[PDB]
Paper text:
Our structural and functional analysis of the chaperonin ɸEL from the bacteriophage EL of P. aeruginosa revealed that the protein is ATPase active and functions in aggregation prevention of denatured proteins. ɸEL forms tetradecameric double ring complexes, which dissociate into a population of single rings in the presence of ATP and at physiological salt concentration. As anticipated, the ɸEL subunits displayed the typical three-domain architecture of chaperonins, composed of an equatorial domain (residues 2–130 and 425–552), an intermediate domain (residues 131–188 and 388–424), and an apical domain (residues 189–387). The domain structures of ɸEL differ from those of GroEL by numerous insertions and deletions, which alter the putative substrate-binding cleft and the contacts at the ring-ring interface. Our functional data rather suggests that the chaperone mechanism of ɸEL is encapsulation independent, and represents an evolutionary precursor of the more complex encapsulation mechanisms used by the group I and II chaperonins.
To mimic the conformational changes upon ATP-binding in solution, we also determined the cryo-EM structure of ɸEL in the presence of the slowly hydrolyzing ATP analog, ATPγS. Double-ring structures were again observed and symmetry-free 3D class averaging indicated nearly uniform rings. Applying D7 symmetry resulted in a refined cryo-EM density map at 5.8 Å resolution. The subunits assumed conformation I and were slightly tilted outward compared to ɸEL•ADP. Interestingly, we find a rotation at the ring-ring interface of 2.9° with a vertical displacement of 2.9 Å. This re-orientation would break the contacts between Asn465 and Glu466 with Asn465* and Arg469*/Gly462*, respectively. Moreover, the symmetrical van-der-Waals contact at the Lys486 residues can no longer form. Thus, binding of ATPγS weakens the ring-ring interface and this effect may be more pronounced in the presence of ATP, consistent with the finding of mainly single-rings in solution.
Numbering used by the authors:
A (entry chain B), B (entry chain A), C (entry chain G): 3 to 289, 295 to 551
D (entry chain L): 466 to 551
The structure:
């Protein structure tokens, strides 16, 4: 009817939509959540998973849907990178929106943003670190998997045994009832075939090799670079044939169909070097330039900027390895590595760690630091392939998902940090931030005027409670004395209820923990999305 | 209109749907049931069978249908594995749902689950076993077939005569008025042709053989294993030709179209061994790895993991049998077996029985034990092919179904257990479980507090009555003294009414019996489905 | 709107539908019936025939139609086997339905069934037999044909002249005004051509033969038996050529297109035996295995189970007849039969009659006995072909139908039995059954308690009246003294009104008779259909 | 049924109080019959009707139940109402 919506009408719809989503999702929070039945054509999808709920919600009107997609996509993006924290995000989205509405005037919006930012900074400082030898890892594994004895014990011991190198765990569909483990080196890499022709059997098979001579290229290769490939390859085969171990690996960013067809002819050009059907030249692709530098260090390959640099080479630069490599369609795997090669890789790993030593406190939790930590795991770390078993085929597939969540949780736990659960960490952060600025006599004049005296602090303290209310409302804890009392006594020793067992105690005592990155991203993502929904006064539905 | 449904609305619809299904199905229970007319395009399907009713119910709204499919599929799955117990299942689904509604608070849901679980445990202990020499088998056969003199007598004698080996009964469409029996050994197997070409006549016919040399493979064979088949076959024909009885049988899990085409050429490669058109090499498929181990023991074949193991073989491993086998499109049949071969098969059968001897009480009724008992019947047991006759063609087809239900009932009867019918077994179980915990002085403090004092026990005792009410309401039994009195006098000697005859007495006296697995699965399936329907507060209808 | 119908709603619709059908059909009963106009696209079909009415009734709603098809098809099935009794059936369907409704409780339903069953038994005992020399046959022929002098006289004399052998009458479209008769032997058989190629002219013509050598096969012949046919045929032509009369007839159950193509080549293989274009080998099909045994006895052919038995034969088994046979597209006809062959056929006919002599009273009216009596008519009995004439072409076609009904009536009359018409036989049966049990002092205690004292007998006595009411309401008979008086005086000498003439008297005196099988089947079919309509409480309209 | 009906006075007085809050509903066992606990609504404390001092006159509760039975029977058995003024 009306494509242009402005005024009281837009903000009315925004609050309407937000309300309906908030009820649907927040109901699924915790082990004591209520289930949702989703239709997907003919079948029924009954689930309690928050991210599945948020993704699957549809509306009738276009206006309503437009608003929904602003809430959905930032929440969906949290589980793609971390793995946990969507419901929490959406909860707070309502929470902070409500706040922005009570305090109008664009000076107050500034005051709210600055206050919450400082709360984030306290959360990052509150972040607790944990080692592989500590029994806390078993507690987190038991909570994330919804109480399993065999699953939590196996992964915890696996990280405990490999004291030094962080083990990488990958999964597969098993046939046996019992689970089977393969403790191997298997240094995982991010390279794979450009074209199916280059593998053993000429149909994208898994080629195993016992010797190679790798060369890393930086540029994306297309039809323009077809001339330089013929120049570089024939130079290497003719001149430097003495110091060479077949096959020659041309690792790069991307290989186009024009370049791949040229390299297929170059394999056919020299048929003498073809041993048992294997092509002696293989181009390899990788989906952040320093990841290729890791690939160069692992395989003792020289780093090359241009394609024309392949001609100007020598015995000093060219080094053919005699290890063991396994090329694949999805990824490559390096198994056998000599003590001489490991000395080079460990020294390069220390160099990245020395950069992380010099970083600041706030920069340690950034994307720059997390990317550098990802490079360390690729270089140092043993690969463990677990074929997950079960009674039926459906149970095997279900158990793989339960295995995957435990691995993703434990890895991110020791990486970033751990905080006390049951919606306590948020309460401690807020009550701390208000108390910190008020206690400090230098800035107490302005700190009180902006936040405390205006009433924003009071409101923000009530909003931290929201997670704690929703989990434990209509339970043994909240039954006593009407509402809950958030006094100084509670701040020192915070009590919660373990919903799995039933007993009452501290989040530290009972063993209820959340990852640091999940709660931080939720609050960061919550602030930005809440501001946008609040400040938006106009909606356009007209298709151009 | 609204794809998202939440609140009082969802649970209202759930109860609405459940009510309509409960009325439709429970009306068909017992011999005194009322018929249902089903349309299926143009024809009318008049039936009293509960599973047919549940499958055929459709609704107009998508919301209503969504709920229906949660009730239907678990009930439909009971008749696929057992053969009886759907109405009973659906009955209790309403029953336990109603219970969950009266006692809110997720602590009470836990209390209900634990209580019912213990009732299941009493039902498993109450399970009575029966032998082939006992006249009770005639009573069960007479009840299941809805009173037939010739049918019940014939099957009961058939199990009674073969005292030791459990006879397998298979059916076929006959031409004569009288029924005809074929008492043969005919050791049934789970193997059949991979491709129609390999049979006699080259069009999937029934090939009879008098000598063979079998080889069992574990892996699923595809295009990748085509090389190893040519290596293994030509090794066997060239080297080990002296100790060989044609034809060679390659039994495996699955044969792809790529592998079958390769083996067709290998038959054509050696035309000297082809006798009267029969191909000398046949690949065989089977739809749980230990079933192939049974196939290996029957035919004296060596168990092989890999396809490459066919090369590395000797006279010690290779053993060509001189019995009699009948290959087929659906299944294979082994008839002639020497006393030397039967000694090997019986010794292997004892080994599986020795594993069942060491199992626990609860583990004996599990899927693990039932699968092992299925292997015993395949190894030891004579096959009896009965060509069922009648007056017309329609009566022959109808009588085959009546024959099939009797066989499925009698086999599962002596396998698992038998309980007293007329909805008595459930009442005895519940009243027993309440009395057991209350009498035991150690746990009486908490047992009373959770179940009895809260009023769940009282409610659960009224719910066991439901089967007994529905069968015998508006009869001679219920007419006296308004309602029925469930006192200690009734618990000792429970009276029922046989609906077929009319007389009054005990379920043991009159001969009304139910299989153990049916009533157990109904209550197990009832608890889980009832909890889900109760805890579900949300419905989604939006197609992604 | 609602696919699921349950409760008061189903039974309401059932009574509604039943009522509308009952009014439409029962109005057409008797010569004083009212006509119905049926549309069938563009033309008008004005008829008084009950079966045409029942078949042609359609409804608007699917629910209503669903109910209709339960009433229609059992009534339609009565005219397919007997030829008369549909209206009567449908009448009683309403009658017994009404009964079942007055007496609820599944014990009373049992009481009603047992009572009516005994009434059937009295009807079977009441059945009167008649001979060909008796003038009663003229009376029945006059009633069935709706008063015709020439038609009733001709058929009655035809059965009277052939005293011993029951004559078979077949019809054809004539050209002359006068009717023409062909008194010939023409022993009718149930065999015809498998393929049109095998006849004279090679296009399914009428082949006349004067000599043959028949062979009867039991099995259905297909592509599997193509090998044994070539073995059997060439054995007979080569070895046993001396004792053979052409052509060779291969009589069987069914001939597939694969087998027929093989036998066509075998005719071409031996062209020396082909006389004037006639193929010397003919396969013959027949649409109950003992009908082929009759075919074997007629033609002196050996009975053969398997196709391979054609090889193992001798001069003792093989016997080539020198009679006269006429093969055809619809049926074959055997005309000339020697005194030697008739001695064999008559002796076989006595053997079937000796089996009918030893049968019980209840077994004599069964399908088993009727099938055996059908075999006697095929063996012994002269065929009479009457070319029916008339003034116009439309009158010839109409007269053929009037001829056919007279033949079907007279044949079934002397076969089963005759009872007094005007709805008297049913009244005598019911009043007799009530009086029989009450008079017998041994069982009078329970007989009174179940039927008489409860009031079922009283009700059943009113229901027998229904046929008598509907025929003679608003006539000279019912005009006197308000209603009709069913006293002991009427039971001794029952009076009726002949609707054709107008005069008053006994059904025996006036000549109003019904066939036994029609009234029995109506009441048998009425009881079963009435019970189903009564006990059905549910309707399903949802297409799967 | 009659045992559930005696509870009615006890439910109406003490529903949504400290006594009924614990363990969902109230448990009328043999332990309670020996020493019956109530809540004094004036003060707030919990104890026996004898201990706290909550007493009813005999004639009041008797007349209530006597009067209750007769009036309840009449209301139940009455199937007809006439409103027409003569
Ligand atoms: N056993 C437990 N007892 C009490 N509280 C718990 C327990 N387990 C988890 N929690 C709390 O509930 C929260 C768990 O979050 P979820 O309900 O999984 O929502 P979410 O993590 O946003 O949803 P996702 O990302 O789709 S798995 C944590 O923040 C804990 O504080
Ligand atoms: N002759 C009988 N007299 C009294 N009770 C009977 C008789 N036969 C069976 N029963 C009872 O009725 C139940 C039979 O179940 P059914 O009516 O067949 O329902 P169901 O087994 O769930 O339906 P299915 O699985 O589709 S055959 C048993 O549990 C018996 O207790
Ligand atoms: N001339 C007659 N006078 C009196 N009653 C007759 C006469 N002819 C027949 N009847 C009676 O009416 C009945 C004849 O049945 P119809 O009206 O033909 O119904 P119907 O036989 O069920 O219908 P069909 O099978 O389609 S021919 C018999 O049962 C007789 O009792
Ligand atoms: K969750
Ligand atoms: K049933
Ligand atoms: K008629």
């Amino acid at each position: 009817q009306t494509l242009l919506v402005h005024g009281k009408d837009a903000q009315g719809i925004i609050k309407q939509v937000l309300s309906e989503v908030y009820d649907a999702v927040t109901s699924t929070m915790g082990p004591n959540g209520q289930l949702v039945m989703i239709k997907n054509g003919v079948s029924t999808k009954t689930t309690k998973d928050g991210v599945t709920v948020a993704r699957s919600i549809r509306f009738a009107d276009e206006a309503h849907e437009l608003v929904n997609r602003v809430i959905t996509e930032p929440a969906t993006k949290t589980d793609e990178e971390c793995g946990d924290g969507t419901t929490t995000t959406i909860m707070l989205t309502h929470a902070l929106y409500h706040l922005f509405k009570d305090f109008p005037g664009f000076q107050h919006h500034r005051n709210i943003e600055d206050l919450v930012e400082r709360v984030i900074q306290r959360l990052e400082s509150m972040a607790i670190r944990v080692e592989v030898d500590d029994p806390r890892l078993y507690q987190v594994a038991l909570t994330s998997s919804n109480q399993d004895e065999k699953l939590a014990r196996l992964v915890s011991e696996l990280y405990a045994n490999n004291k030094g190198s962080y083990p990488d765990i990958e999964l597969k569909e098993g046939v046996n009832f019992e689970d089977q483990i393969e403790q191997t080196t298997g240094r995982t890499i991010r390279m794979f075939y450009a074209n199916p022709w280059f593998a053993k059997g000429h149909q994208g098979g898994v080629t195993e090799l016992t010797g190679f001579t790798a060369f890393v290229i930086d540029r994306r290769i297309d039809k323009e670079d077809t001339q330089k490939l013929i120049d570089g390859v024939n130079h290497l085969v003719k001149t430097h044939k003495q110091h060479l171990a077949l096959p020659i690996l041309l690792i790069a960013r991307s290989f186009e169909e024009a370049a791949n067809s040229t390299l297929m002819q170059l394999n056919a050009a020299h048929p003498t070097l073809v041993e048992d059907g294997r092509p002696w030249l293989i181009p390899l692709s990788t989906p952040g330039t320093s990841e290729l530098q890791d690939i160069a260090v692992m395989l003792n390959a020289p780093m090359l900027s241009d394609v024309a640099d392949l001609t100007k080479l020598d015995t000093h630069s060219i080094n053919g390895q005699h290890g063991q490599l396994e090329l694949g369609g999805n990824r490559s795997i390096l198994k056998s590595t000599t003590p001489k090669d490991e000395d080079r890789i460990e020294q390069h790993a220390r160099g990245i760690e020395e950069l992380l030593e010099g970083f600041s406190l706030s920069d340690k939790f950034s994307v720059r630091a997390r990317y550098n930590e990802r490079r360390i795991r690729t270089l140092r770390g043993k690969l463990i392939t677990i074929s997950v078993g079960g009674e039926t085929y459906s149970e095997v597939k279900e158990r793989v998902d339960r295995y995957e969540d435990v691995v993703k949780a434990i890895r991110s736990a020791l990486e970033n940090g751990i905080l006390p659960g049951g919606g306590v960490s948020l309460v401690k952060a807020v009550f701390g931030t208000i108390k910190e600025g008020l206690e400090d006599k230098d800035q107490s004049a302005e700190f009180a005027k902006r936040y405390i005296n205006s009433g924003i602090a009071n409101e923000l303290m009530r909003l931290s409670t929201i997670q704690h209310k929703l989990l434990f409302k209509d339970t043994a804890l909240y039954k006593e004395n009407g509402s809950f009392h958030f006094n100084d006594d509670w701040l020192n020793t915070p009590t919660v209820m373990n919903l799995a067992t039933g007993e009452i105690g501290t989040p530290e005592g009972l063993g209820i923990y959340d990852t640091a990155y999940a709660s931080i991203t939720a609050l960061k993502g919550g602030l930005q999305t809440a501001k946008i929904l609040a400040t938006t006064k106009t909606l356009i539905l007209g298709e151009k």
